[PDB]
Design a protein around this ligand. Structure first.
Ligand SMILES: Nc1nc2c(ncn2[C@@H]2O[C@H](COP(=O)(O)OP(=O)(O)O)[C@@H](O)[C@H]2O)c(=O)[nH]1
Ligand SMILES: [Mg+2]
Length: 405
């Protein structure tokens, strides 16, 4: 019997619309992520049939029938996938990507010219947020000749050559007909390994959703505290731990604007449909709390950072960022130059995957100083920052950096 454990790794699935992201996640997990009426999420166990040859030995359920054996397969690990509905939701979650994803799959349709517009954008975005454990999946090989597939494969290798992605593998599949999916599972095991995690690091969690789960007319004894949804960035949380929500509540007192942390306690921990006593990075987690549900209703806490109640975590209104920029971005028409950062500019800053607006107060060499609309939690040195600028009416990623404390 396979164990019941949390996912230990989260994989973002990106690529141009209709290239087959959701079909691919279904082929792997058996789950259709967009059966909802907001992020698609799906988990699967991964195993291997010890006496079978690879890649067919790799399986996603406890059976070896797919490789002609009656044996029970060995359990390797549980993994999960993030699959967004549409470009705008996807790009929005990419701003939190570093916290959410241990790796990524870029889906490329074999029957469309490469690269498609969102293909280019998603690939650039992955570099910016630093999620570079990448697999490129060449999908829909069932509707082109082997020659056409081979030709596109070589275009892609030419594209990645000279970039950070030069050594990224390309795995051809048909998500629809489940062809060569076992090769992809094998590739996930090789190229998106579970990271080394130092579980003695101070616990930090990003909040991506918050809920009031009480139906109307719920009686007193059946009421629940506010529920928080998110991803554990580092460390380990436990049931019954005291925690605080950062920066907290915005307050106007003694002639100043300030933020007061929200203190509470973890009542329960859930991954998918199982309850746990602890929670580590990997997977999206649901945290039950003792919060008044009015504080969590309608994603009120979205973008909060959660730590233990006594954590020494600075919450800063002004930050210094050491950064680098893109040379150009793709305009709807054609290439737009990325202008240097100038004082007084308004930027969107994603700091350790929590996002706010800010005004540049100083620029020198490769550092900026920014005054933020609300303050950000900074729990270590070299917290990665995404810098975005409004270009032609839209926020665009233009750079990345590290927060210097
Ligand atoms: N022929 C073929 N069609 C596919 C394959 N994978 C997906 N499709 C089709 O492509 C369309 C878009 O797929 P979908 O998973 O919704 O793409 P997404 O927008 O990237 O999530 C659907 O009609 C799928 O059935 C494949 O491997 N072969
Ligand atoms: Mg989809």
């Amino acid at each position: 019997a396979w164990p019941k454990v949390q996912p230990e790794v989260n994989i973002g699935v990106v690529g141009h619309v209709d290239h087959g992201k959701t079909t691919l996640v279904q082929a792997i997990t058996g789950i259709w992520t967009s059966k909802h009426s907001k992020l698609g999420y799906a988990e699967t166990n991964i195993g291997v049939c010890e006496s079978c040859k690879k890649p067919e030995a790799y399986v996603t359920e406890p059976s070896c029938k797919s490789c002609g054996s009656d044996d029970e397969p060995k359990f390797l690990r549980r993994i999960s996938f993030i699959d967004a509905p549409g470009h705008e939701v996807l790009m929005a979650t990419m701003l939190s990507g570093a916290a959410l994803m241990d790796g990524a799959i870029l889906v490329v349709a074999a029957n469309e010219p490469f690269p498609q517009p969102q293909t280019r954008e998603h690939f650039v975005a992955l570099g910016i947020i630093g999620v570079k454990n990448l697999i490129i999946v060449q999908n829909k090989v069932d509707v082109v000749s082997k020659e056409e597939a081979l030709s596109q494969y070589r275009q892609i290798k030419q594209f990645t050559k000279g970039t950070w992605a030069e050594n990224v593998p390309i795995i051809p599949v048909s998500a629809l007909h489940k062809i060569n999916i076992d090769s992809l599972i094998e590739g996930i095991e090789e190229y998106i390994k579970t990271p080394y995690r130092d579980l003695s690091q101070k616990p930090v969690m990003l909040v991506i959703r918050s809920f009031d789960v009480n139906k109307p007319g719920t009686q007193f004894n059946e009421l629940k505290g506010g529920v928080i949804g998110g991803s554990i960035i580092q460390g380990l949380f436990k049931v019954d731990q005291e925690i605080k929500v950062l920066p907290g509540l915005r307050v106007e007192k003694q002639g100043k604007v300030s933020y007061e942390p929200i203190f509470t306690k973890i009542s329960s921990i859930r991954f998918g449909d199982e309850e746990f006593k602890e929670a580590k990075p990997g997977g999206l987690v649901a945290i039950g709390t003792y919060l008044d549900p009015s504080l969590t209703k309608a994603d009120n806490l979205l973008g909060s950072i959660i730590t233990l109640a006594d954590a020494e975590v600075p919450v800063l209104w002004n930050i210094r960022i050491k950064y680098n920029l893109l040379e150009r971005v793709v305009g709807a028409k054609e290439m737009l130059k990325v202008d240097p950062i100038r004082a007084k500019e308004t930027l969107m800053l994603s700091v350790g995957s929590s996002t706010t607006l800010g005004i540049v107060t100083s620029v020198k060499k490769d550092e900026i100083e920014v005054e933020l609309r609300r303050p950000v939690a900074v729990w270590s040195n070299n917290i990665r920052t995404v810098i975005s600028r409004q270009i032609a009416g839209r926020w665009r990623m233009i750079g990345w950096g590290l927060v210097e404390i």
